[PDB]
A paper describes a structure:
The crystal structure of MaMIF was resolved to 1.8 Å resolution. It forms a trimer, with three identical molecules in an asymmetric unit. A monomer of MaMIF is made up of six beta strands, four of which form a mixed beta sheet within one subunit, two antiparallel alpha helices and two shorter beta strands on either end of the sheet. The trimer adopts a barrel-like architecture formed by three inter-connected monomeric subunits, as has been reported for other [name] structures. The trimeric MaMIF structure is retained by the short beta strands β3 of one monomer and β6 of the third monomer becoming part of the beta sheet formed by the beta strands β1, β2, β4 and β5 of the second monomer in between, together forming a six-stranded beta sheet. Herein, β3 of monomer-1 comes in close proximity and form hydrogen-bond network, typical of beta sheets, with β2 of the monomer-2 and β6 of monomer-3 comes close to β5 of monomer-2. This contribution of beta strands by all three monomers to their respective adjacent monomers to form beta sheets seems to provide stability to the trimeric structure. The alignment reveals that the residues responsible for tautomerase activity and substrate binding such as Pro2, Lys33, Ile65, Tyr96, and Asn98 are conserved in MaMIF as well. As the residues of the catalytic pocket and ISO-1 binding are completely conserved in MaMIF, ISO-1 and other similar compounds binding to the catalytic pocket would block MaMIF catalytic function as well. However, the MaMIF structure from this work did not have any sulfate ions, presumably because the final crystallization condition did not have any sulfate.
[name] ([name]) is a pro-inflammatory cytokine with pleiotropic functions in various pathophysiological processes. Unlike all other cytokines, [name] has a tautomerase activity, and it performs this enzymatic function through an N-terminal catalytic proline base. Our analysis showed that like human [name], MaMIF also forms a trimer in solution. Alignment of the primary sequences of [name] from hamster, mouse, and human was performed with PRALINE program. Figure 2A indicates that MaMIF shares 93% and 89% sequence identity with mouse [name] and human [name], respectively.
Numbering used by the authors:
A (entry chain C), B (entry chain B): 1 to 114
C (entry chain A): 1 to 116
Write the structure that this text describes.
């Protein structure tokens, strides 16, 4: 799984160790081994929600399975709560797009997962 | 809806007003209240298009519905035109990828839209 | 096609001309004309892979066709190898997501590729 967070929160407001926390929490939440979890946090972005520059985040979770209606509700409660708390973003200014990737469409280590 | 623009045009070339203007135009094009519209502009990128470093942009519009070939022509005429003019980019060096998201695959406010 | 590379390798570690090289390599591998290929490299990123901040990359290739199980294996061998060598990244710390785009879902020049 790959989790990306783009945010207008500045880098100094991003806790050191957020990427480790996300890695461990995503391992637990998805049941996928930590070895396969990648995280990418992009602070200082020029972004708006509702046309305003108040703190916001646009995120994505890509995974080969472990994605779907009920699971994504759970993920959204976990990850909106964690980002809202850690980055001080209102949860109604966070989107998370979920992507169920086919194993044939993910390259890694010079091959694909198919 | 979520609109993302990645460009090699510098930050000083991005009008302060542009994210508000994009919000207004996307609200007209989609009918959605600003509350649901997110815009993300990423200037100063290392990019090429046709193997050249001339000004370009790579963009995405994610929307729950309201996506398809006919409708995307309307979005493309609107958004290519506006970005070309505001960012001083030739319209033939702008791509916009459209993504029709399932409501179950968009997290917001601690839940999903499903 | 569009190829994006996000990496924690610093900008100084990106060899000059890598985006030209990627353009050429993608052109030959996909059979798409270079004129339609865009490349975006995003260095200095805050990233982890397996919970470690060692060099890694997360990439995407979007293309109208030329995507599929066998093709993607060929692209992955080529692009993992090239990025590993150029950016000094272990191949087991690179993901590449592939996306087969409908022509109707790619806007370009004020229209779409389905209409061009």
């Amino acid at each position: 799984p790959m989790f990306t967070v783009n945010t207008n929160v500045p880098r100094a407001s991003v806790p050191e160790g957020l990427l480790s926390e996300l890695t461990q929490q995503l391992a637990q939440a998805t049941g996928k081994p930590a070895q396969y979890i990648a995280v990418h946090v992009v602070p200082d972005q020029l972004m708006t929600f509702s046309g305003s520059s108040d703190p916001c985040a646009l995120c994505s979770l890509h995974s080969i399975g472990k994605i779907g209606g009920a699971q994504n509700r759970t993920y959204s409660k976990l990850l909106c709560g964690l980002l809202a708390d850690r980055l001080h973003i209102s949860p109604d200014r966070i989107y998370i797009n979920y992507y169920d990737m086919s194993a044939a469409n993910v390259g890694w280590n010079g091959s694909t997962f198919a």
